[PDB]
C-alpha cells in the first residue's frame, strides 16, 4: 500500500503549508510574565485567537485549488471553518504540550472568566484527540478537510468545493490503511472527531453571544471573525 505520485504531491503541499505555523515569541513571553487574573488571561487568549486567524488564512491560501474557487466562496469557507480549525489546532497544542509553558497556558484558559459549560467539553475533546495519537499528516489533512467543507452556509458552487475535499479524504483513508493496517476503524475514529468538532460551532457561538457589552470578555474583533 502506497500513495500515488499525485497523492504524494497533494499531501506534500498540505504538509509544507501546515508546518509554517509557529507560536510567536511575544505571545509565549506573555503566558510567562502577565498577572494571573481573569482580565490578563482572557487578553492572552484574544491575542492567540487573532494570531491563529492570520495563520489559518495563510494555510488555506496554499491549499491545492483553494485559489481557483469563486472569491465569495473562499470567504464563506474561511468564515465557516475559523472556529473548528481553532479547536483542532488547540487539540494539537494540548497533545504536543506547546509552548513547552503548556501547564501555565492551561491554567490561564481555566481562569479567563469563561464558564465551565464551555471549558469542560473543550478539554474533553483534546483528551479524545490525544487518544488517537494523531500524526502531523492527520492534523494537517483534517484541518484541510474542515476548511474545504462543501456544506458550509453561503457557498454558491458546492461541487467545486467537493472536487477539492474528496481527494483529501481519499489520501487520509489511504494513510490510515498504510500506517494502521491492524486498526481498520482508525479512519472511522478520525471522522468521529470531525463530527465532535462541528458541535463546537453552536457552543462557541452561544458563548460569544452571552458576553455583555460591559463585560471584560466583550471583543468586537472576535465577533467579526467567529459571528
Amino acid at each position: 500500500m502506497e500513495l500515488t505520485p499525485d497523492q504524494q504531491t497533494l499531501l506534500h503541499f498540505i504538509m509544507d503549508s501546515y508546518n509554517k505555523q509557529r507560536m510567536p515569541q511575544e505571545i509565549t513571553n506573555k503566558i510567562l510574565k502577565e498577572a494571573f487574573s481573569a482580565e490578563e488571561n482572557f487578553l492572552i487568549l484574544t491575542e492567540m485567537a487573532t494570531n491563529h486567524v492570520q495563520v489559518l488564512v495563510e494555510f488555506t491560501k496554499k491549499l491545492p485549488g483553494f485559489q481557483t474557487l469563486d472569491h465569495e466562496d473562499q470567504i464563506a469557507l474561511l468564515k465557516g471553518s475559523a472556529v473548528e480549525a481553532m479547536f483542532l489546532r488547540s487539540a494539537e497544542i494540548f497533545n504536543k504540550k506547546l509552548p513547552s509553558h503548556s501547564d501555565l497556558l492551561e491554567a490561564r484558559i481555566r481562569n479567563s472568566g469563561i464558564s465551565d459549560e464551555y471549558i469542560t467539553p473543550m478539554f474533553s475533546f483534546y483528551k479524545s484527540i490525544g487518544e488517537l495519537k494523531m500524526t502531523q499528516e492527520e492534523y494537517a489533512l483534517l484541518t484541510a478537510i474542515v476548511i474545504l467543507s462543501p456544506d458550509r452556509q453561503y457557498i454558491k458552487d458546492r461541487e467545486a468545493v467537493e472536487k477539492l475535499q474528496e481527494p483529501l479524504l481519499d489520501v487520509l483513508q489511504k494513510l490510515c490503511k498504510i500506517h494502521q493496517p491492524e486498526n481498520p476503524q482508525h479512519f472511522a475514529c478520525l471522522l468521529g472527531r470531525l463530527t465532535e468538532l462541528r458541535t463546537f460551532n453552536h457552543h462557541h457561538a452561544e458563548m460569544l453571544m452571552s458576553w455583555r457589552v460591559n463585560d471584560h470578555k466583550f471583543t468586537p474583533l472576535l465577533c467579526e471573525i467567529w459571528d
Partner: peptide, 12 residues
C-alpha cells in the same frame, strides 16, 4: 462585511 478576512485573503 468580514473586512479583516477579506484583507488577509487578498493581501500578498
Amino acid at each position: 462585511d468580514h473586512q479583516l478576512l477579506r484583507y488577509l485573503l487578498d493581501k500578498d
